[PDB]
Scaffold this active site. Structure first.
Site, PDB file in Angstrom:
ATOM      1  N   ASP A  21     -40.728  58.719  44.686  1.00 39.05           N
ATOM      2  CA  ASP A  21     -39.921  58.163  45.760  1.00 39.05           C
ATOM      3  C   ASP A  21     -40.676  58.179  47.084  1.00 39.05           C
ATOM      4  OD1 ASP A  21     -39.761  60.810  46.748  1.00 39.05           O
ATOM      5  OD2 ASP A  21     -37.621  60.664  47.168  1.00 39.05           O
ATOM      6  N   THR A  22     -40.251  57.295  47.984  1.00 39.68           N
ATOM      7  CA  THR A  22     -40.784  57.213  49.338  1.00 39.68           C
ATOM      8  C   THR A  22     -39.849  56.321  50.142  1.00 39.68           C
ATOM      9  OG1 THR A  22     -42.718  56.726  50.710  1.00 39.68           O
ATOM     10  CG2 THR A  22     -42.212  55.215  48.942  1.00 39.68           C
ATOM     11  N   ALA A  23     -40.094  56.265  51.452  1.00 38.69           N
ATOM     12  CA  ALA A  23     -39.273  55.429  52.323  1.00 38.69           C
ATOM     13  C   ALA A  23     -39.423  53.950  51.986  1.00 38.69           C
ATOM     14  CB  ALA A  23     -39.633  55.683  53.786  1.00 38.69           C
ATOM     15  N   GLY A  79     -32.136  50.388  47.470  1.00 40.57           N
ATOM     16  CA  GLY A  79     -31.444  50.864  48.651  1.00 40.57           C
ATOM     17  C   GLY A  79     -32.356  51.422  49.724  1.00 40.57           C
ATOM     18  N   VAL A  80     -32.512  50.673  50.816  1.00 39.18           N
ATOM     19  CA  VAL A  80     -33.310  51.090  51.965  1.00 39.18           C
ATOM     20  C   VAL A  80     -32.501  50.767  53.215  1.00 39.18           C
ATOM     21  CG1 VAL A  80     -35.375  50.695  53.338  1.00 39.18           C
ATOM     22  CG2 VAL A  80     -35.546  50.834  50.848  1.00 39.18           C
ATOM     23  N   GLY A  81     -31.997  51.800  53.887  1.00 36.15           N
ATOM     24  CA  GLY A  81     -31.169  51.627  55.057  1.00 36.15           C
ATOM     25  C   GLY A  81     -29.949  50.765  54.797  1.00 36.15           C
ATOM     26  N   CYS A 139     -26.830  53.500  60.386  1.00 30.32           N
ATOM     27  CA  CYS A 139     -27.562  54.650  59.886  1.00 30.32           C
ATOM     28  C   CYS A 139     -28.803  54.904  60.740  1.00 30.32           C
ATOM     29  CB  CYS A 139     -27.955  54.442  58.424  1.00 30.32           C
ATOM     30  SG  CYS A 139     -29.193  53.152  58.159  1.00 30.32           S
TER      31      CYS A 139
END
Lengths: 469, 469, 469, 469, 99
Positions: C245-247, C295-297, C302
Site C-alpha cells: 500500500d501507499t498514498a 479509494g484515494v481521498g 477529508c
C-alpha cells in the site's frame, strides 16, 4: 403528472425538490372543496393512521372514524382485543363523543390520570347512568390524594337531550364557564358530551361509516403463519379493511399471502406494501391486492437508509407507483414520514389516493401512551417505548431462548423517541383541522373542487437546495 | 434577459442561483446613476414599503416620501385615520424633518417614550410655538420620573431660519455638541429640525412629490365588500396610489374588483397582486390593473410553502412576469422576502420596476411599533405583535361568534417574530442609504446610468449550491 | 451496473447520490443469504480490517479470523513480532475464544487494565492450567489497589469440556449470574471461554481458515527497500495475504515493486493500491497484482482533499475500477471511509469483492489502544495517538537528524482523533453483527442469495441533495 | 482545461465543485517539482501577498522576497515610506535574516514588544555593532518592567562568519539550547541570524532577485489622480512591479489609467484588475496591461455578494480569464479568498500563473499588526483594525467635511475581523512551507514537473454538494 | 525510584509520582543508566520497555561527598538530581539541592 417546461432533472425528487405553481381558480373558499376519496376505503378525508401500537388506540379509532378517517389496528393484538375494540367503535354515536366516566368511591389519582386521556378536559361523574358533575383542571391540585371522587365535584354542567341541533348547543355554551355540553338520553341516562369546537367539527366533517351506519375501522395482519385464518377471523370480527404490511413488500412470501387472502374472496378491499417501484406495484396488484402501499426508507438520514443503502425519495416513488397503478385500476397510499401538511398535499398531488400518518399522531392526548412531564413540565410521550414489548410478545412464537436470541442479535433496537405534546394542538382533532386546512388551501391555490381534479390540473416545478441556506 | 452561453438550467432560479458578470463600464462613481422609476408611481427610488400595520406608519410615510419612496397604507384603517395621515403627510416640508415636540408640564416618562420614536435622538420643547431646548439621551437617567419637562432642558441648540442652504447648516454643526439644527420660521415659530446626515441626504436624494408639490402616499384596499366605494373614498382623501392585495391575486373575485375599480376611471395607477405566472399577469393587466404585484411564497421554508406546496422561486417568477408585462406595456413589482440589497438589485435586473420591502423595515425607530429591550438590553420590536388585532377588528364584519370561530379555526396564527434593532442603522434612513448604495454599486459594476439601461445590458450566470458549503 | 431510465448525471456519484430500488425477491429471511467472497482471499464475509497500528491488533486478528474476516498487519512491525502474532493466531481454537488470564500474586490494577482488553467482561484466574475464578466488573471497586488477585475471586463459573454442542452451552447459561462458560480440555486444563452471543455467532458465522484448518491472517509491506526480501520473510512467517500500500498506487515504483514480488512466484494472492482509475487498475493488474485497492481521498472535506485538489467520489471510482478489473479477471477492494453499513452495501453493489474498514474499528475493546475515560467517564480511544511513533520508528531509516527534519517539515502531522466507545457495541463482534445484518437486509431487499447475484440484479437510482435539508 | 466525460454542468463551478483525478506519474518526490512562474514577475513560487496595510509590511516584503515570493505595497503610503522600504529590502542578505536588534539602556517592555515582531523568538543585543546576547522567551517574566536591557542578557549564542555552508550551521545547532545562529561579518560586526529551519529553507527555496542581485518588491497605485506621476515616482524609487487595483477593473477610468501608465513605457510588467470576464480581460490586455487580476466577490456569502448581487464563482471565472488571456499572450492572477492550499492548487490547475493571498497572512508574527491576547491568552491580530485610518488618510484628499461625510455615508464600514495566531505556524515561513507542500503534492499526484505541465495534463471532475453533509 | 529494564512505561509513570524527587532512576546490574523525568511518558507508546526514552545526562558522585559540593555541581544542571553511587560503582541513592 405535468411539470414545467424544461424541468427534467437527472435525479429522483423528494418533497423538498418540488413546488406547486398557482393556476386559474374559481373556488370561492376552503369549504367549497370535497376531500372524499375514491379508493374504496370509504373515508371522507385522505388521513390514515398507521398500524403501530403507540398510535393505533381505541380512542384513536373512535375519534378518527368520527372525523371521517380510518385507523388500522396493530397485527400483534389478540383476536379478543380486536373484536372488543371493533364492537366498542361500532357502538359509538355519530355526533357526540364518549366522555371520561368516573365511578364513585374511586381514587382521585385515577381521575387525574383519566383526565388527560382525552382532549375534552373534563371527566364526567356517573352514578346509576346519571351525570353528577364534571372534574376539570386544577380540581385535584391540593386536594387529598385519597379523595373518593364525590368530594370535589362541580355540578354546574349544561345538559341537553341527544339530537339537539349543534347550533343551539353552541349557543348555550357562549357564557358557560366550562366548555362541556352533556348530552343525555331521553330517559335521563348519560349518553355523551359535546364542545363548541366539537360541534363545529361535527357540522363540517362527515364521519366515515359502513352500510350499517356504524364507524369504520381497519386492521392489519402479519406475513407469518396462516394468513387466511387471521383474515377470516378479522373479517368475522367486523373489520372493514385488511392491511398486510412488512419491511419489503416485493417478495414471494407476500405474493403467496396475498393469493391466499384473495382466495377466500371476502369481498373487502386489501392493502399491501410496501413497494416503491412500478414492477412491485404491478406484481402486488396482479397477486390480488386492491390498494398498494408506497414508501420504503424515504428519508436520506433515516434508520433504514443508515443501516442499509436501500431506499428511494418518496415523491418520485409515489409518482411512479400511482402512474403504474392507475392504468391497472388500482390505488396507492403514501406511507412515508409525514410531519407537515405539505407532505400530505404533495402526496395527494402526486396521485396518491390516501396519505398515512405515523409517529406524528403519537404526541396527542388520545394516543394510548401515557402522558408524562419533563423537568420543565413539558408534556411528552415515549414513542416506541412499549411497542418493542408488543413486538416480542408475538415474535417469541413459542421458540426457545436460543432461537429468540439468535434472531434478536441481528435485530436493531429501535430507540425511544420522545414526542413533545403541542399545547395548542394536544388533541388529534386540532391536528386534523391543521392538515385539512392545509389540503383545502392547496386545492384552492390549484383551483380544484376535489382530489381527482387536483391531481388532474396540478402543475409542478423543481427547485434547488440553495434556497435552504 | 440575457444569460451566459450554455447556462440553461432544468429548474427555476432563486436569488441564490444567479450572479451578475461585470461588463464594460463608463460610470465614474455611484452618484452618476439615476434611480428614477418609469412605472408611473413617481418615486425616485425603487423602494416601496409594504402595507402591513407594523411597518406602514405615519412617520414611515413622511420619511419615505421625503427620501423619494412611497408607503402603502393598511387596508384595515378607518377612512378618518387615512385622511388624517394623508393630510399630515401632505402638510410636511420637503427639506426639514418634523421633530418630536414636547409640551410643558408633561411627564418625563412620556418624553423618554417619544425620544425613541424618531432617529433624531433629541426631542424639542415647544411653548407658544417657540423652541426652548432639546432633550437628548441620558437626560432622563436618574432624574425624577415625575419631572415636568421644563426641569432638565438644555437650551444650547443652534437655530437658523428655514430656507438656509444645507451646506452652511452643516457648517454650523461642525463643532456643536448636539447634532441638531433647529429650523424656524421667519416669525420665530418652530418649523422643523435638520442634521448633518439629514442635510446631506436632502442634498443627494429627491423627494417624491405630486403635482401640488406635496409628499406622495399610497393606500391599500381589501377584496371584500364594495371595493368601488372604498376606492372613491381613498381617492377623495388624497391618495396617490391604490393597491388591491390578497394571498391569491389570480382569482375571479380580484378580476371583478379590478373591473369595478377601473369602471370609476379615477385616473390613478392601480396595483394588484399577487401572481407569479405570465397568464395571471396578462389577466390582471387586461382586467384594468396598470401595475402587477409579483411573489407568492418565495421562500423554500416559508410559512406559505410549509402549510401548502404552492409557491415559486422569486427570480424566475419575476423574470416571466416582467417579460409578459413589458409586451402589454405594464410593470411588475417584486413583493417577496427582502433582507439584503442583493435581492433588490437582482429584482431590478430581472425587469421589475419597483421592489417592495416588508418586515425588514419593522426593526427601525420610525416604525409604529414600540421599542423594548431584552435581558441584555437588546433593542427589538415585535413584528406582527399587534397586526392580528387590526386584522380581526375588520375580520369580524359584524358576524356572530359562531361564524368568527368557524373562520378562525382554519386560520393559522401568525407568530410574533422578534426583530432586533441594528444599533448602527436604527433609523430607516440608514437602511435607505444601505440599499441605495447597493443598487448604485450594482449599476456601476454593470455599467448603466439608469434602471432601464441596467435591465438592458445585464448579463446573468448560474451557480450551484456547492459554493454555500 | 444498471441504472434507472434517464438517470445519466453529469457528475461523479458518491454514496449519498445513489439508492437501491427494491426488486422482486424470493429470499425468505436474512439467514438464506451467503456472504462468501470469490476474490480468492478465503473470507466468508466482505469485512476487511485496515492495516493501521491503531486497529490491526493481535486480538483483532484472532477475533476477525474467527468471525470469518481477515486482518492485514502493519508494515512497520518487525519480522519477529509478525511471526509471533501469526503463530498465536494459528494456535487458536475455531470455536472458543481466548480469555484474559491472570496469574496469582499479580496486581489488581493490572487485572482491571486487562479486564477491558476484551468484550467478555470477565478475566479468568489460572493456576497450574486450572481455572480458579472469574473477575468481573465492580470487583476491583473499593478493593485495595495492591490486591494479589487471589483475594476477590468468585469461584462460581460454569465449566464444560471442549467439544460440547453450543446449544447445551447456551442452555447451561440460561440462569447463570455471569454470562461466561469456561471450556476446559479433557485433562482439566483451561482451554477457553464461551458466551451465549458468542455461541450463537459461532453457530451462525464460519471462520476463515487455510488448508491447515488454522485461522487466516494478512500482512502489509512498504514500498521502500527490498520488497522481495520482506515478501519472502512474511511468506515464510506464515502470512496468507500480502498487501503493498501507499498514498498513490499508480506510480512506477509500485509497478517495479509488484513486478519484483511477482517474480518470486510465491503463489499467494497480492493486493495493491490505491488507484481510482481504470487505467491504474489495468496497469496494476498487468504488473502482477491479483487484487486492486480502490479509494484515494473519497471525502469532499477529508485531509487529502483539503491539502490538495486530488480525489474522486468513491462510488464512481469503485464502479469504474470493478468494470475494468472484471474483464481482466481481477477484483477490487473498497478502501474509503466507512462509517455505516450503507457504505459497505453500496460498495458491494458497485462490484467490489471486499470492503475494508478503517478507523471505525478503532473504537472497540479488542483494539490494541488503551481505554480511557473523559470527564463524563465517556469511554474513548485516541485514534492515531501512537501510530505516528510507529511510523517514525521506520521512517528514520538510520538517516541523520538533518534528513529526518527535512522530510518531516513538509509532512503534515495527523491529529489525534478521539473515538468514543459505543456502550451497546463495545466489542468488534457487535459491529460485525451490525454490518452483516445491514448487508443481509440489502440482499433480501434486492432479492439475491449471494454477492455475485446481488451485483448482477442490482438496479440503482440517483437522488439530489435537496433531500438532505 | 480537460474535464471528465459527460461532466458538463449547467452552472459555474467553485473550488468546492471540482476535484483532480490522479493520473500516471513519474515524479519521484515533492522536491522534483519546479514551482517557478512564467508570468514575468520573477517569482520562484506562485505566492503573492495582497496589497493591504494589515499584511503588506516591511518584514513581510523581506521574508517573502527571501523565500521566493513578492509583496505589493499599499497604494496609500507616502513616496518617502515606499522608497525607504524598497531600500531596506534591497539592502538585505540573500541567506541570513535580519534579527531584532536592541540597543543598550532601552526599556525591557520595548524588548518584549519587539520579541514577538519576528518568528526567530530571540532578540539580539547589539553594541558598537557587536552582539552581546540573545533575549528569549520568559526572560522578561518577573523581571522589573524598567530593566535596561543589559541586565538579563544571556551570552551563550553560537557565532559564525557569514558565508558558512548552512549544513555546518545546522550541525553546530544540534545540541544548542537556543535555536539561533548569529552570523557575523569578517570584521566581527553583526550581520544577521540563522536557524535550523531557516537554513533548510534557504537551501531548498530560491530568493526572487532582480538583475542587481537584490530582493524583489512590488507596489500598488490608486486609480485617482495623476496615475502617471505616481507610476514614475515608484519606478524611480526602485519598484519591480506596479499594480493598479480597484473594486471594478472593467471600467473606462481604469482603461484610461492603463493607457496613461503604458504611454510612459517604463518597461516593467503591469498588473490590473479585477475582472472575471473574458471581455474584461481582453480589454485590459489591449489597454496595455501585461497581467490581469481575476476575482470579484468570489464567496456566496461575502460582503460584496451580500451588499449587491454582483459576483461570480472563482473557478469558472479564472478558467475563462486564463483561456482568454493565453491566446492574447497574457497571464491571470487569482485574487479571491484563499484559506487553504487547495484553493491555490485549484487556481494553478485552472491556468492562473500566480495566486495572491490576502487576510490569511494577517495572522502571523511578521505582519505589521501588533500581537494581543484574548482572555484565554489566545494570540490574535485585528484584521482591518487600522486599515480604515490609512484609507481615510488619503480619502480626505483635502476636501471639506461635507464632502467627506457625503462620501462616507454610502460607504460601508468594514468590520474588524479577529485573526487568531496559529501556535504551530506563527511565522509566515511555516505557512509558506504548508502551501508549497500542498502544491508539490498536487503536482506529484497529477504527475508534472512544473506549473505549465500541471496545467497541461490536469484532468478535472465535478462533485455534488451532498458530499458535504 | 528504581526501574528494571523491559518494564512497562505505565508502571514507570505510576512509580514516578510515588516520591517527590520527580525522576526515577533506571538500574541494571546495580548501575544507573538514566533518569526518567516528567513529560517523558507523554506521547510515547504505552507499551514502552523503559530502555527507550532514557536520558543518560545525570550527575554522578560517590557517597560521602560533602553536600556543599553536591549542591555546587547542580547549579547549572537541567535536572535537579544528583546520583550518589558506592565506591564500586553500584547505585546507592540520590540527592537534591533542597534535600
Amino acid at each position: 403528472v405535468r411539470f414545467l417546461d424544461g424541468h427534467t432533472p437527472a435525479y429522483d425528487l423528494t418533497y423538498n425538490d418540488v413546488f406547486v405553481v398557482p393556476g386559474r381558480s374559481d373556488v370561492a373558499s376552503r369549504f367549497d372543496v370535497d376531500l372524499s376519496t375514491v379508493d374504496g376505503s370509504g373515508t371522507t378525508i385522505p388521513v390514515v393512521v398507521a398500524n403501530m401500537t403507540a398510535v393505533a388506540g381505541r380512542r384513536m379509532a373512535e375519534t378518527v372514524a368520527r372525523r371521517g378517517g380510518i385507523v388500522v389496528l396493530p397485527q400483534d393484538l389478540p383476536i379478543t382485543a380486536v373484536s372488543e375494540t371493533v364492537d366498542f367503535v361500532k357502538s359509538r354515536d355519530l355526533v357526540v363523543d364518549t366522555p371520561v366516566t368516573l365511578s364513585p368511591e374511586d381514587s382521585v389519582s385515577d381521575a387525574n390520570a383519566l383526565l388527560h386521556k382525552r382532549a375534552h378536559g373534563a371527566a364526567v361523574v356517573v352514578f346509576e347512568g346519571r351525570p353528577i358533575g364534571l372534574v376539570t383542571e386544577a380540581n385535584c391540585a391540593g386536594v387529598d390524594r385519597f379523595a373518593r371522587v364525590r368530594d370535589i365535584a362541580l355540578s354546574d354542567f349544561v345538559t341537553a337531550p341527544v339530537g339537539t341541533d349543534p347550533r343551539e348547543v353552541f349557543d348555550l355554551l357562549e357564557h358557560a364557564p366550562i366548555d362541556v355540553a352533556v348530552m343525555t338520553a331521553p330517559d335521563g341516562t348519560l349518553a355523551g358530551v359535546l364542545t363548541r369546537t366539537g360541534a363545529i367539527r361535527a357540522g363540517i366533517y362527515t364521519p366515515a361509516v359502513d352500510a350499517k351506519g356504524r364507524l369504520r375501522i381497519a386492521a392489519a395482519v402479519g406475513i407469518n403463519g396462516d394468513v387466511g385464518a387471521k383474515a377470516q377471523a378479522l373479517a368475522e370480527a367486523g373489520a372493514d379493511l385488511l392491511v398486510i404490511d412488512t419491511a419489503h413488500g416485493h417478495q414471494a412470501k407476500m405474493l403467496d399471502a396475498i393469493k391466499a387472502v384473495a382466495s377466500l374472496d371476502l369481498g373487502l378491499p386489501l392493502v399491501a406494501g410496501n413497494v416503491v417501484s412500478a414492477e412491485g406495484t404491478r406484481d402486488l396488484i396482479e397477486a390480488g391486492a386492491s390498494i398498494v402501499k408506497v414508501g420504503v426508507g424515504p428519508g436520506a438520514m433515516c434508520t433504514t437508509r443508515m443501516m442499509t443503502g436501500v431506499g428511494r425519495p418518496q415523491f418520485s416513488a409515489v409518482v411512479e407507483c400511482a402512474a403504474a397503478a392507475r392504468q391497472l385500476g388500482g390505488h396507492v397510499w403514501a406511507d412515508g414520514g409525514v410531519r407537515h401538511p405539505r407532505d400530505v398535499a404533495l402526496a395527494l398531488a402526486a396521485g396518491a389516493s390516501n396519505v398515512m400518518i405515523g409517529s406524528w399522531f403519537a404526541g396527542t392526548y388520545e394516543s394510548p401512551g401515557d402522558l408524562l412531564f419533563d423537568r420543565d413540565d413539558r408534556p411528552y410521550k415515549e414513542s416506541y417505548g412499549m411497542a418493542s414489548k408488543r413486538a416480542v410478545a408475538a415474535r417469541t412464537a413459542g421458540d426457545s431462548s436460543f432461537d429468540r436470541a439468535r434472531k434478536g442479535l441481528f435485530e436493531e433496537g429501535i430507540s425511544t423517541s420522545r414526542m413533545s405534546l403541542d399545547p395548542a394542538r394536544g388533541g388529534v382533532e386540532d391536528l386534523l383541522d391543521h392538515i385539512t386546512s392545509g389540503v383545502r388551501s392547496t386545492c384552492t391555490y390549484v383551483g380544484a373542487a376535489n382530489l381527482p381534479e387536483l391531481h388532474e390540473k396540478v402543475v409542478l416545478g423543481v427547485q434547488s437546495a440553495a434556497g435552504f441556506a
